[PDB]
Amino acid sequence: SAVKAARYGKDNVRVYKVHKDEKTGVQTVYEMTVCVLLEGEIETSYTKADNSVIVATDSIKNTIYITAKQNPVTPPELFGSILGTHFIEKYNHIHAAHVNIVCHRWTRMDIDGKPHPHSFIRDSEEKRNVQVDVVEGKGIDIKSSLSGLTVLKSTNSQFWGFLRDEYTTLKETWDRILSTDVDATWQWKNFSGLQEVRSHVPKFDATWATAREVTLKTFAEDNSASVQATMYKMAEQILARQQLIETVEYSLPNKHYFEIDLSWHKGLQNTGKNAEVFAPQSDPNGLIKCTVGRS
Amino acid sequence: SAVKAARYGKDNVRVYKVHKDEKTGVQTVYEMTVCVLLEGEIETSYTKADNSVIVATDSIKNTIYITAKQNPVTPPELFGSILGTHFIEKYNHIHAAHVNIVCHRWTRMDIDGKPHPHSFIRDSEEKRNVQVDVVEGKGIDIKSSLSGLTVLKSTNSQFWGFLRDEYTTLKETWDRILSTDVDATWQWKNFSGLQEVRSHVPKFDATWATAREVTLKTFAEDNSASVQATMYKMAEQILARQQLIETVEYSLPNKHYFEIDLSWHKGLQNTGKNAEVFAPQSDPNGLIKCTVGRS
Amino acid sequence: SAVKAARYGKDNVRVYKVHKDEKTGVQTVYEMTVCVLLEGEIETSYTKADNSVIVATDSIKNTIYITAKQNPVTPPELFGSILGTHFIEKYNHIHAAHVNIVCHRWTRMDIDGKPHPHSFIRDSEEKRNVQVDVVEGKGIDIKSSLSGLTVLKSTNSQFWGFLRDEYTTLKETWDRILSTDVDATWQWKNFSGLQEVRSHVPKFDATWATAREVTLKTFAEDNSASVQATMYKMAEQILARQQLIETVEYSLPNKHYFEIDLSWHKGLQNTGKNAEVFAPQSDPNGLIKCTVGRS
Amino acid sequence: SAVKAARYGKDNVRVYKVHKDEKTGVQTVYEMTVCVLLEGEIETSYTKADNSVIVATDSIKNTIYITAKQNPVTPPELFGSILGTHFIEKYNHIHAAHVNIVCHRWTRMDIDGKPHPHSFIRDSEEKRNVQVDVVEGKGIDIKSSLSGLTVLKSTNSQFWGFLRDEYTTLKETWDRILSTDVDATWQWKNFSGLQEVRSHVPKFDATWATAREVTLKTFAEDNSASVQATMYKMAEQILARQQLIETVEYSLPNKHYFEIDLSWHKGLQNTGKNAEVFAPQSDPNGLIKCTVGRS
Ligand SMILES: O=c1[nH]c(=O)c2[nH]c(=O)[nH]c2[nH]1
Ligand SMILES: O=c1[nH]c(=O)c2[nH]c(=O)[nH]c2[nH]1
Ligand SMILES: O=c1[nH]c(=O)c2[nH]c(=O)[nH]c2[nH]1
Ligand SMILES: O=c1[nH]c(=O)c2[nH]c(=O)[nH]c2[nH]1
Ligand code: NA
Ligand code: NA
Ligand code: NA
Ligand code: NA
Secondary structure: EEEEEEEEEEEEEEEEEEEEOOOOOOOEEEEEEEEEEEEEOOHHHOOOHHHHHHHHHHHHHHHHHHHHHHOOOOOHHHHHHHHHHHHHOOHHHHHHHEEEEEEEEEEEEEOOOOEEEEEEEOOOOEEEEEEEEEOOOOOOOOOOOOOEEEEEEEOOEEEEEOOOOOOOOOOOOOOOEEEEEEEEEEEEEOOOOOOHHHHHHHHHHHHHHHHHHHHHHHHHOEOOHHHHHHHHHHHHHHHHHEEEEEEEEEEEOOEEEEEEOOOHHHOOOOHHHOOEEEEEEEOOOOEEEEEEEEO | OOOEEEEEEEEEEEEEEEEEEOOOOOEEEEEEEEEEEEEOHHHHHHHHOHHHEEHHHHHHHHHHHHHHOOOOOHHHHHHHHHHHHHHHOOHHHHHEEEEEEEEOOEEEEEEEEEEEEEEEEEEOOOOOEEEEEOOOOOOOEEEEEHHHHHHHHOOOOOEEOOOOOOOOOOOOOOOOOOOEEEEEEEEEEOOOOHHHHHHHHHHHHHHHHHHHHHHHHHHHHHOOOOOOHHHHHHHHHHHHOOEEEEEEEEEEEEEOOOEEEOOOOOOOOHHHHHHHHEEEEEEEEEEEEEEEEOO | EEEEEEEEEEEEEEEEEEEEEOOOOEEEEEEEEEEEEEOOOOHHEEEEEEEEOOHHHHHHHHHHHEEEEEEEEHHHHHHHHHHHHHHHHHHOOOEEEEEEEEOOOEEEEOOOOEEEEEEEEOOOOEEEEEEEEOOOOOEEEEEEEEEEEEEEEOOEEEOOOOOOOOOOOOOOOOOEEEEEEEEEEEEOOEEEEHHHHHHHHEEEEEEEEHHHHHHHHHHHHHOOHHHHHHHHHHHHHHHHOOEEEEEEEEEEEEEEEEEOOOOOOOOOOOOHHHHHEEEOOOOOOOEEEEEOOOO | OOEEEEEEEEEEEEEEEEOOOOOOOOOOEEEEEEEEEEEEEHHHHHOOOHHHHHHHHHHHHHHHHHHHOOOOOOOOOHHHHHHHHHHHHHHEEEEEEEEEEEOOOOOOEEOOOOOEEEEEEEOOOOOEEEEEEOOOOOOOEEEEEEEEEEEOOOOOOEOOEOOOOOOOOOEEEOOEEEEEEEEHHHOOEOOOHHHHHHHHHHHHHHHHHHHHHHHHHHHHHOEEHHHHHHHHHHHHHHHOOOOEEEEEEEEEEEEEEEEEOOOOOOOOOOOHHHHEEEEOOOOOOEEEEEEEEOO
């Protein structure tokens, strides 16, 4: 036997950073969960108990905090690129660094209609994420995403015209609820290294904003023929709006809301046009995925 | 042996309701998780296999949906009171109904700066809850609450002057982070029945709004001497603002953010006044509780 | 306004302890999650920013570790009693200590059919818990419990003879699945203090063993008329077997497994007597509770 | 823009099946969570609202239940292969089926030392899983795994000799706790189709048993130089014991248990050789991965 692949490091490293403006008193906070996994010439740590090649995961943890102290932690695409570059540059025998960052929301509070200088609210579990793969001699591959964006529309979703055979019981519908948890990823063209990433820094926040805007507006406004068709429209527009993106991925559950037939009780009418009370279903759920690239 | 207490019913009943305005096209959604547990002369179902006294929990489930079809589901204090009253009135041998409702957020989307008529976003896992105890001959006892309201302030929290003895290692501080998950409950004076609850319907939404407003503003503005002192100020104000409340309860974790001493690395200064990067601690956590009544 | 109730302390304190036998090499591990909340003359910490009365929760944490170092952590009823007694004895102004302990399973591994001296497996998320309330001048009140014990029986559960009215759709059945998560609590007669608790130490492990044995055997062997009737039989027997228990509480969800009618597909028969494939339902669920005392 | 990849189906489909022996009365239960995602000529459902190419996910759900009714659900490798083969054979335009199965534990109860014929206990959240990828013209690729196997050893783990530089604070140790959650995957050589899978049916349960046995024994007996070195030994042995496996993957967190220095309190000695009470750390955690193939 032989090692075919190996990567190791520290997961679930929680990180907070504050920025304080001396002149204005305005503080700004960032909170993240970081994972760094390293690859390189480390196979003998597995096969020969040779720990000399191990950069201890405890030290990877320390390095995450130190890097956050000495560099901007925003946008996360930049921070991850700086962090991953560090490991491959500092250690000759380490040839890739895999940096995953989950950014947690801390939105500034409005109190009596004015922004407060140092108080924040977690306005949802929606996350902004990056996957930054820094590979020696092969640049920096970045995937950016938003996840946990939970939405519902109460009409203007349809699903009819699907295949019907001996396995089919679902009725066609021209008016249903659609609810999902949006997982949307935009994959950047390869960067040659940290310099190139830095040359594009403003595009990271702007493209996240575009992705979120397009997601929400398309969801709200598309009289949806299916989850498939709606998600494709989102992907199309994001590609049109940022040429440095190569592909857009969506992964969307269809979180079903079932009608409840109550006609058995006093002839109560709660289906079709008269549907007002529904049963949200925890499981099962449709799962719809696609990756959209340029023609 | 003998039954000293008994209650039974259906938990985790998920409920959605939509309201559609024919004239304007504007739809409004509500989503809840409901639990109903009944008490009464049911001890023989436990001791003598006498199921004749059981209102099947499946039927309790049906009744929840039917009640939601035939009545407003907002404010949840009203809906729970209607639902609980039903069981004690319909079944001679049922003498109490315990109704717990968790309301989930579906906030109307703003698209290109205008409210959308049928699309919604879950802007956090913060919940609005009620516990409605309907007891035959003893009226309706309601506890209202908000929970899962997660906040952080990056300065203007202190903790000094606490007891110090041979078990103490914590350093006094005049500037720390404070973060919590707010669980705040306001307990209504007893209502004699459904009529009295109905006479106060507008006060339920208004008092929830007050509780949330007071929580956030006091958290943001109090240069906090401790969690104890800050939460008490919140409770005080809520009691002052709604005379039909008898008590206010807060349950607040102190979700610690620890400084990280990095001076071991190149003499990096990241403590005290120079603290910028912190380690959020998942556990343990302080837990601070109080119930405030009127003097 | 005035403080009507107050308690504060440290939650989610994770604790491991190892015992090593020098003579045999056999090591034994214990792992717990501890919560300690204190009451006493502490109201001025809430109303007057008077932190002098606060035993810092950080110090409560330290004390938990120190107490675990200097005393047995098993049985948890004893450990909690020692810990709670400490706070009320050490601090004149603290008059109650509320100690909650969740014990996590670490079962010794059997390797090639012999017990291993220092390797363990978590053979489920089933917990053994205590709630120890140490109240100055009022002794020690202990509730012991097992929770997260998940079981299923595939036949010999029935449910028929329940009330039927205009809200009822459930069919009577003489053969169904029953699955639950057992939450069982036994409440000890008040102890006057730590000495009395110590006088009964062997009864704590034995009564937990009895409770678990009775639960499992009664679940397996009772041709159940309902959840109500089966749980009562468990409670009865536990009371019969330990006179120092005053009451037994069960809280049992009915985790439904629904038949699936497949006759629409090639006339496939999968109901009643021919039922083989079922749909486990995540929600809703029945919830059945009772407290049983002595006649 | 254009679809570069697409797959869709039903996730979180809960399935129970019972087998009843008429002659002996002995019943046996299986419970799973199933996900099926399909690929094929379905791009027009995304780009042209062409639902005619969609096998509705609701129908995929039905098919899962029907397949479970008409076939053995054990071993899960076989069931998944039957299920995936169905979709690619039944639908000309569907060319791959991705079947993920999580098997939940229902272990027969022993009551008064004899196996009970129809009562079961969930003896942990450890899962047995399969990922079965059925690809038209490319056979059946199966990955089998065990996950959620949580273990601890209280000594005979070491970690010394690792790289030390200006980022390192971790002390070398010759005696520490090691605890992990085992995620172990064995990847089968490609099968040409369902016939070939069937020809190997007994090897699936046997190889899972071997993987679990080797994991536990190696964990218990290896005086571990590191997580890396121990996991490699497990992988080596599994490959040696089943020639139809091509690779073995392990993914192991190092769930840290920290010493607690209590010498500040009455000179209490709880480190090194005197370490008895530790603080389990929820986060961060090491994460160690490798894929082992044959030389
Ligand atoms: O938008 C949908 N897409 C599907 O593929 C599908 N399948 C299904 O059952 N309902 C839906 N809805
Ligand atoms: O506000 C606080 N209250 C306490 O009771 C306490 N105890 C502690 O350790 N830190 C804090 N902070
Ligand atoms: O054992 C049961 N008890 C009930 O109270 C009940 N109600 C119900 O719908 N099914 C069951 N089953
Ligand atoms: O077995 C270990 N491997 C590592 O890579 C590592 N890194 C670390 O900090 N502790 C450990 N332990
Ligand atoms: Na390198
Ligand atoms: Na009544
Ligand atoms: Na005292
Ligand atoms: Na095909």
